[PDB]
Design a protein around this nucleic acid. Sequence first.
DNA 1: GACATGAGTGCC
DNA 2: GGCACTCATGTC
DNA 3: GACATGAGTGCC
DNA 4: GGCACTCATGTC
Lengths: 281, 282, 281, 282
Amino acid sequence: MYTLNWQPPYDWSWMLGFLAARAVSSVETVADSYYARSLAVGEYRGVVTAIPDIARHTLHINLSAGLEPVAAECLAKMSRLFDLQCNPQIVNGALGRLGAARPGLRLPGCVDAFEQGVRAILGQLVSVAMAAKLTARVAQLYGERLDDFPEYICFPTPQRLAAADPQALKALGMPLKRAEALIHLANAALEGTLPMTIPGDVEQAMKTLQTFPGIGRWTANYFALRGWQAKDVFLPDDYLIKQRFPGMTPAQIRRYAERWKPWRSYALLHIWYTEGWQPDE
Amino acid sequence: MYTLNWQPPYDWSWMLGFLAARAVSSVETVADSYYARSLAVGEYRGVVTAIPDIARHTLHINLSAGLEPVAAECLAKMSRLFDLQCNPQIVNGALGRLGAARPGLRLPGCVDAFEQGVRAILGQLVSVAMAAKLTARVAQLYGERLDDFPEYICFPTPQRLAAADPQALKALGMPLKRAEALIHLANAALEGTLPMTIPGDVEQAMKTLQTFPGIGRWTANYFALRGWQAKDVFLPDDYLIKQRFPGMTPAQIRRYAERWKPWRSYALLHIWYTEGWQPDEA
Amino acid sequence: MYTLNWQPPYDWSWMLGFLAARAVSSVETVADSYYARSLAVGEYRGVVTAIPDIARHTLHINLSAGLEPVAAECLAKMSRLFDLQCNPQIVNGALGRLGAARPGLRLPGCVDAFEQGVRAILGQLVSVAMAAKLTARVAQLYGERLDDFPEYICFPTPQRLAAADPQALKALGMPLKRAEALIHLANAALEGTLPMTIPGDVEQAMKTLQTFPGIGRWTANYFALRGWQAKDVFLPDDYLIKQRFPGMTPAQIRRYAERWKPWRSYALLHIWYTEGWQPDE
Amino acid sequence: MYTLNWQPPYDWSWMLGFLAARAVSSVETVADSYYARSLAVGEYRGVVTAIPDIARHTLHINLSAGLEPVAAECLAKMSRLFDLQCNPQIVNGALGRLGAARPGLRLPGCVDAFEQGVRAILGQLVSVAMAAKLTARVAQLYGERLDDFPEYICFPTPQRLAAADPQALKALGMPLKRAEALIHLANAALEGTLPMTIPGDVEQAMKTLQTFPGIGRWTANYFALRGWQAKDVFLPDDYLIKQRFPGMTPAQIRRYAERWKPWRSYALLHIWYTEGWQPDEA
DNA sequence: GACATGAGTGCC
DNA sequence: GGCACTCATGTC
DNA sequence: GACATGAGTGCC
DNA sequence: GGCACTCATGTC
């Protein structure tokens, strides 16, 4: 029973719902009143269970004893996932109209940059429900099961996914060039060459990211947004985004989205999860 | 306020005593009952006071209003510095007669890898104290002061240090080379080339760190041990260490410490803080 | 005097007109009857005088006494400069109509690969007159003067351009990026990185040259043509060539030329000095 | 046919003698009175023949019909191979007593850097004789046999040795590292990485050369000597030279040889060919 | 201590 | 000889 | 969506 | 011209 604070408002329905859609089976359990998922901090494994208390602007978090040792980090990863630092008063006060409808919006982070990297790559070209399935199986194959909670399994580590048989992965339902992008990224992780935290110069780190085999501008962006919780990104090479800016080209979009600096990550979320939106005259 | 649990025993006097020796004026403050320093997380800043309660083997952390928005990432920082994850019954067991002198011995980590990167560099050649004096100058010079707390000053940030003139840093009391290194490290932080988190493959990653100008095996090993809290890395290159195996080569020494696997970071710490430990008269 | 012959025809009035245009004040003198310049081959320096004997198909090459110990290399420099190895029967008899008005057409080489390297970079963008004027400047600042020939000066060497001050080269009237290009090339020449002789895989080579900052595809081509006298390279990136093929783009052209392989470098010339030439629409 | 000049003295006996001993079969021929080998220059092949005229102080160069369009470059090649540019008064008058006995000594260049690389490589660890037979086999397989003079085959081109199976080369009588070395060399060759002419900064170039697999410091040196005809390199690594400097190590030798700058390459040849030469008492 | 560097030491 | 690998110097 | 191509564009 | 970025485009 640990507890963290958040500034109101906080749209849990939206947040959870979003995690739900993308929830990988066996690993994540998203329910209308709580989120709980397996988790590893090195060799310490167990299970996290966040339970927002909309009442007392607090997010209670329970930890399995196999993680009590690394309570701090765990507690810290959760805070990155649910964007607890956000001050909506500032963000919506900067976006106005755009964020005025759903002021409780928050940037859906992650509980580990490497997991996200994989999540990102596997999210390419396919749909959400589809990807959360392709991942589930990938987790199924290289994921450490919790001797303390068989039901849950840990996300494939970089070393586990580094010693990955390409055809083995490809045989799970992805081009080989995809599984090659992973085995690679997995290595970066191992040799600490993959920024596990948001860097000072994000533009750089991203360009630098766009070199990794299999990682392009859309993946690098979506990765900086979700993996580094970078607050000022935007995905103008995104299927959905293109539809919200009819005709407009990625450049036209990037150009446009500048009116929302320095909170383009949020402007983005407000546009994605807001059907029918369209640019101004 | 916020509190974190730990596994006894815990040599707080030793831990505080160690931190205080390397403390940097205007940035830290260590007493016998608590530790306190400035701290930055993103743009959020302020003060973290850490008070241990030996009776409840619990650490009470207090953040100034400036940090609450990133409280969690703060506690993580602290627990990493203090090594609260350590379970003495395991380490002390595996090492045995080695650390039984003081089992509460913990591995002093850091609250930030970059700062520790800067510290391990200026920590080159000079004495612990002198290194603490230099880091102080660079901090006073390139650090930012806290509004909420005038007295305190934040550690120099990566960007501020990248955009710094080698001469100025040189003038502080360090060779130009040393200064080029500080400035180099600063960018790997901005570019994200310098790991702020313990990488899966330490060995490799450390090797990679040595490609960096100013970072030899020693700075790599050490940084690995402090900045990442790596628990199975020995320092045969270290000064006092060569003096602990009087008349011995880094490979025999490094070959020696292989019995203390996989907690050579801990076996190392026990050697240092053992007034007169001479290799087992075998 | 020394003699080296050639296979007729040989348009000397054209060849000489060519070098004349790109002549470099103080390094070369060119009249309708002869070519002459300063020439260095290590610590051996002097003036090379070449006089064509159209009458009996032979080129006379006189050499200043300082170059006498390295006559052979001096003649090879001249032979490569004037493409005397050429056989107009083979080339012209493989270009057909394209090469019929001027069969005495030869491929203008160089006397020093590095020099041509420095020339190519400087020929970038500016016109021929300016390029020549510009190169003359660089020579004046960094070239060695001759004791027997005060009027002449040797083209600057790599040890001198590699140690040049970017800002000084900048001052001479060139983009800092450009001066940094000469200095980088100079360093390559010092390390043995710059191919001084037509390399096995011309294609590959040019690809490795483009990695040199300052060197693009046009520069890596004109350097190959003039610098290695490589006989099979086209230049759709070239201005005059661009328009010799109006409408056609650097792929259409590049494919059209395929028809001329492996003498595409000559093809390039004839089309260049044939004001009125049209492809087959 | 063509004639090139040279400054006296010129020890032809020594020179032809040196070339002969390393003469590769089917590629070159060496007789008391002349030197003749196959020569390719792009799509032009023929046979070059050199006959030194001691009276006129000239080297007569003959070329088979195939090479007449690239005649001058063939002369330029021969000139490098026979060190014709050398002014023995400069060297000897500076090299001191070292080469007073045989003032007509010259630097045996080569007629193609690549061939020379191949030869420096093939010649590692084995006797001059073995190297010759070794190379000969290599040439007889991947080389272009001339049609006008069947007993002559042009030394293998880059693109040819580049495509060679690392196993055939092994078959001819050599390890495998050695064979990949040639294929690596052949590759550097194709892309323009192997310097075919003496580089502006020799020391640098050698440093770089040693990065090539198969090429160490010896090979790197022996190549700068024969392959680029650099006049100021020494071989503190050669077996023979080590014997000429008893009990000294590459470092002492090299430092001792510094007394022969800028003509260290010549000093080397003199020493190499001096039964029982020995440094000065110390 | 970082780093250039010399030196010895086996193996392929 | 190339190459891996490890002591031991000698500036800064 | 990544990634070669090309083909154009525009800022040095 | 060198280049970094851009707007399709066909493939996987």
